């Protein structure tokens, strides 16, 4: 019911992204915005998803957001593509499998002061994670590299399933304000370990907007 | 590859059971035996078909290579319990061989105890799984009769707004089914570490894990018999928390 009043952007519509898109659609999220870069992949996903739950609204884009020109458009849609035009999306989800795209999303979110979550799964399928980022309040993707160790074909879609479900659950807890949102939640599939933590921002982060947001956040006193 | 050589029985094709059946089918499990006893009340046009034949139609369409055997009876009846034991002992990939794993995805204690009674009689390893009515917690448990606690060794373990639940339920089922299946793969394929018990608290992203030793005074004498057979086997080197 209340869930129908939110919009979520999802970047990366393969692997963890398709499962996540499908779960959110099945929950009746008001709007999903889909970004990927090859009907194209996103318009294909939109078609399948709208069949699953026609209550959900979609907007899709197929451009490479790592060029500054497309990055402009990406930021425009984050800021204005909410359920009602001209309002921001409530959350951005990174379900991408490369560093450049991920860092690209981090740069947009730092610029906009947009809360987002990033997720990943290993090629080997033995591990994955989700993380919440609140620019200026918690570590962004540029503040520090990933340091949490993984204490050492069928498995791969399964691990994607677990990570996607945990992601969606945290999206629901964030949008609907119940339980506790995780800041970092890891998944070691071989051991059934779920390491968790949160990290403060790096005051010397390379991302000058992360730095800017931190100051703005501190200033609230 | 190797996963194609295994047979898995799933009791209860409801929430976690259907997700689980679907994942296993997508993995290319050799065979699924499906047991349940009510009708579709999934996709809306199956409303009236038995749950088991409906799931079978969907799953076959997903992966035609998996072999399906389905039964639509109440296993808590002695007569149907005989049939159930027959298919567990003999409904393996090769007929006359046991099923490699039984998965309990039923919603009630009686059916769980029923599956437990069969598995102790047969010495059949199984996993008991569930999602709470509150929609924000679930669990999986590995029962190796004689080696780990059976469902009767101790009473039921518990893992500590409507719109919340209505949204959460499907996704908690997803998480629990996913972790169940990962454990099924780890158990069948023998890699990594299989959890004897794993709970999931969705409110706090808590995944408590432990194992339980058998209760040497279990009400189930087959449990006890199975314990002594296991104690014979090992005989050289297992402490409880004090
Ligand atoms: N004695 C029984 N024999 C066969 N099937 C059963 C029995 N008891 C329960 N079931 C089925 O088990 C399923 C339970 O699913 P559900 O109520 O969705 O809970 P869950 O969270 O999936 N575990 C239902 O489809 C029941 O019809
Ligand atoms: Zn930073
Ligand atoms: Zn017992």
What does this structure look like?
- 2 copies of one chain form a homodimer.
- Chain A has 221 residues and is α/β, with parallel strands linked by helices.
- Chain A has one domain: NAD(P)-binding Rossmann-like Domain (Rossmann fold, 3-Layer(aba) Sandwich).
- Helix content of chain A is 38%, strand content 18%.
- Chain A has helices at 16-26, 41-52, 68-80, 99-112, 155-176, 208-219, and strands at residues 7-11, 31-35, 57-61, 91-94, 116-121, 127-133, 184-188, 196-197.
- An 8-stranded mixed sheet of chain A has the order 3-2-1-4-5-6-7-8, with helices on both faces.
- In chain A, helix 1 (16-26) packs parallel to helix 2, helix 1 (16-26) packs across helix 5 (155-176) and helix 3 (68-80) crosses helix 4.
- The first copy, chain A, is globular, with a radius of gyration of 17 Å.
- At the A-B interface, helix 5 of A face helix 1 and helix 5 of B.
- The structure holds phosphoaminophosphonic acid-adenylate ester and zinc ion (2 copies).
- It is classed as transferase.
- The entry lists the keywords rossmann fold, transferase, Structural Genomics, Structural Genomics Consortium.
- It forms a dimeric assembly.
């Amino acid at each position: 019911e209340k869930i129908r009043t939110f919009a979520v952007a999802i970047v990366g519509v393969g692997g963890v992204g398709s499962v996540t898109a499908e779960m959110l659609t099945r929950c009746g999220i008001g709007k999903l915005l889909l970004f990927d870069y090859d009907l194209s992949k996103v318009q294909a996903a939109e078609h399948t998803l709208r069949n699953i739950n026609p209550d959900v609204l979609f907007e899709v884009h197929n451009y490479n957001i790592t060029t500054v020109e497309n990055f402009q458009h990406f930021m425009d849609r984050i800021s204005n593509g909410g359920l009602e035009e001209g309002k921001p999306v409530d959350l951005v989800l990174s379900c991408v499998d490369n560093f450049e795209a991920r860092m690209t999303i981090n740069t947009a979110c730092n610029e906009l002061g947009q809360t987002w979550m990033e997720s990943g799964v290993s090629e080997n399928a033995v591990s994955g994670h989700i993380q919440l980022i609140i620019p200026g309040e918690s570590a962004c993707f540029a503040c520090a590299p990933p340091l949490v160790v993984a204490a050492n074909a069928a498995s791969l879609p399964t691990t994607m399933g677990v990570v996607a479900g945990i992601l969606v659950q945290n999206v629901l807890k964030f949008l609907l304000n119940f339980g506790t949102v995780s800041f970092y939640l890891g998944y070691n599939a071989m051991q059934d370990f779920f390491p968790t933590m949160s990290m403060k921002p790096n005051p010397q982060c390379d991302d000058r907007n992360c730095r800017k947001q931190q100051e703005e956040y501190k200033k609230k006193v």
